[PDB]
């Protein structure tokens, strides 16, 4: 079987593989986003439309630190409450779909643990540049 | 709906260069899964596949003709030319262009593997004589 590189897949691509098969294929979806009368009217609403999904994403993003980083680590510690199952088990036994249908009950808690972490990671960093 | 039509000079004299074009119509070659394929027939005798293009502008020769064939594809004029040179009496074969569908599936990365050539073209005649 010859092998495509992962650039080639088309939108929604690798979405019934693993989470670690699926994490080469960012890029594909990044692209797709923000691809008088009657029908100008829905066009015009469905163009706005489209702006405020697409910057809700980014806001979040900012406030996070991850700004354009596809990939970002932080330094929030993972709790076992909201996940209790292997690091093997997760990246090579099921999907996205099932993953984020999973934790979408501890999503409020977690983003905002990413904002005040983020935040105290910017006054501790100003204090130390004030040294000089 | 697809459909393949070739075309090309029956007769055709040894030791010069040779042109095949496949013209295809109801899909293009950049989405996935898109690609055609060069096979040949003897008369009275199995097939033989020549080569391939891919929708990833990849191409795949047999090895026993890599340095006699060299294939190209054309996005404007929607048609894929097939240049083969420095032919041979044994080369008096069908030429058939015909479009491929697959599969796709991920094993230590994404691959892409052929279930069967569907759609044919209608074939044409070159004869090496004088």
């Known amino acids: 079987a010859v092998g495509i590189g992962a650039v080639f897949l088309g939108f929604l691509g690798a979405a019934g593989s693993t989470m670690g098969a699926a994490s080469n294929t960012l890029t594909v979806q990044a692209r797709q986003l923000l691809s008088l009368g009657v029908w100008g009217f829905k066009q015009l609403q469905a163009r706005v439309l489209a702006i405020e999904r697409y910057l809700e994403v980014q806001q979040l993003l900012g406030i996070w630190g991850c700004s354009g980083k596809l990939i970002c680590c932080t330094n929030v510690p993972w709790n076992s409450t909201w996940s209790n199952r292997t690091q093997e088990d997760i990246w090579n036994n099921m999907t996205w779909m099932e993953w984020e249908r999973e934790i979408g009950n501890y999503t409020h808690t977690i983003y905002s643990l990413l904002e005040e972490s983020q935040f105290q990671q910017e006054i501790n960093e100003k204090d130390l540049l004030a040294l000089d | 709906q697809v459909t393949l039509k070739e075309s090309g000079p029956a007769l055709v004299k040894p030791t010069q260069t040779l042109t095949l074009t496949c013209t295809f119509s109801?899909?293009?070659?950049?989405?996935?899964?898109?690609?055609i394929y060069w096979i040949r027939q003897p008369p009275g005798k199995a097939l033989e596949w020549l080569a391939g293009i891919y929708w990833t502008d990849s191409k795949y020769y047999n090895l026993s003709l890599k340095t006699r064939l060299t294939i190209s594809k054309d996005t404007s004029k929607s048609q894929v030319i097939l240049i083969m040179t420095n032919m041979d009496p044994v080369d008096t074969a069908t030429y058939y262009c015909?479009?491929?569908?697959?599969?796709?599936?991920?094993?230590?990365?994404?691959?892409?593997?052929?279930?069967?050539?569907?759609?044919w073209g209608q074939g044409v005649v070159v004869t090496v004589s004088s």
């Open positions: 109801g899909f293009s070659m950049s989405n996935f899964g898109s690609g």
């Open positions: 015909a479009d491929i569908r697959g599969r796709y599936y991920y094993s230590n990365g994404f691959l892409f593997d052929v279930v069967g050539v569907e759609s």
